[PDB]
């Protein structure tokens, strides 16, 4: 009757991994946004394409897939699964 | 009794995806660090890039031991 303990341990370990993967991607995209802005600022100092940088910049900040708020659902689903 | 085979087979495939995702972020992280240095070099021809550089390579979220640790937890689960 230890299947629930095995499943809960595996699912608890798995759910932790998704959260860690999410954090690194969010941390990277923040660096990329800062990375691009500093590049564009230097490009303007050299003297157009800044409209292109604005559009791709908004796409980075305007994601909708919502990688969070559903990992929380996954952690929830395990919780009432264990009490069985 | 077929549940044990399905559970182990499903968990093995999930672990493979976890390793592939973790490897793919690390390669991007190295490129971002390298890319910043090239732009930083062009700037001189200061600061707040060193702090970002230290932060990029200074993470303590592991992701190399937990995925490893997950692999064993499946293994004795297969023994049942």
């Amino acid at each position, epitope marked *: 009757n230890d299947w629930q303990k095995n499943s809960t341990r595996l699912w608890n370990s798995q759910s932790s991994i998704d959260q860690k993967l999410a*954090n690194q991607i969010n941390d990277l995209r*923040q660096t990329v946004i*800062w990375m691009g802005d500093r590049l564009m600022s230097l490009e303007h100092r050299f003297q157009e394409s800044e409209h292109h940088w604005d559009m791709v910049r908004r796409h980075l900040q305007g994601r909708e897939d919502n990688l969070t708020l559903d990992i929380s659902k996954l952690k929830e689903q395990i919780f009432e699964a264990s009490k069985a | 009794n077929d549940w044990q085979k399905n559970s182990t087979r499903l968990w093995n495939s999930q672990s493979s995806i976890d390793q592939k995702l973790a490897n793919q972020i690390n390669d991007l992280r190295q490129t971002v660090i390298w890319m910043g240095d090239r732009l930083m070099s062009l700037e001189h021809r200061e600061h*707040h890039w060193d702090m*970002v550089r*230290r*932060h990029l390579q200074g*993470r*303590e979220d592991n992701l190399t031991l937990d995925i490893s640790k997950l692999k064993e937890q499946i293994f004795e689960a297969s023994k049942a």
Partner: antibody
Amino acid sequence: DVQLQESGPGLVKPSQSLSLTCTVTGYSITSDYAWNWIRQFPGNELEWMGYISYSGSTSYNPSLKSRISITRDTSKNQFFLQLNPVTTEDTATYYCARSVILGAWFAYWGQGTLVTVSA
Amino acid sequence: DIKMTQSPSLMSASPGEKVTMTCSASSSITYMYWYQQKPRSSPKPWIYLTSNLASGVPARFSGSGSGTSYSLTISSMEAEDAATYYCQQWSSNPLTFGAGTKLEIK
């Protein structure tokens, strides 16, 4: 070279708008870095409230995201905090902070103004 | 959110000794930071990424730790070191601060 100085009211009645200012000198709040708001309760507990980036992107603490809003004035080089409904639990000491854009490293702090909420 | 626990809440130590501070996280974190706040003053940044001392911090201070257990230690306690120390983690929104471990001079 970077100095943060906050000013605001000291007594605010319950269920009233709280306003604050942070005059930054020696640097431009549009050039780089993030600009945070932090408060300390009388039990010496620290809580982070939110920040506005150097481009205007803002994030807020989920525990109080509903009733908080941060804006700024580029020409005067100030960024402001607003907490529209307040209660006696908001008696704290509010601080400014400039942090690195990637992580949360408050390398500079304001003098620290005290706000007491009562009638 | 992540609950950051510091032990002990209050410690005393005569000058010249060696002291240690522990700040244990409820779950995994990404970055670790340390501050001090003397009375009637703003917190001062000292330690970032759990090992690097900020400018102005004397070499007698050092930080260490990994996983969910981080430590701040003083090789030789001096006079001006008596203050409340705060540990801060940054994993996701929002960031959480420690409870504050206050040091004393005996």
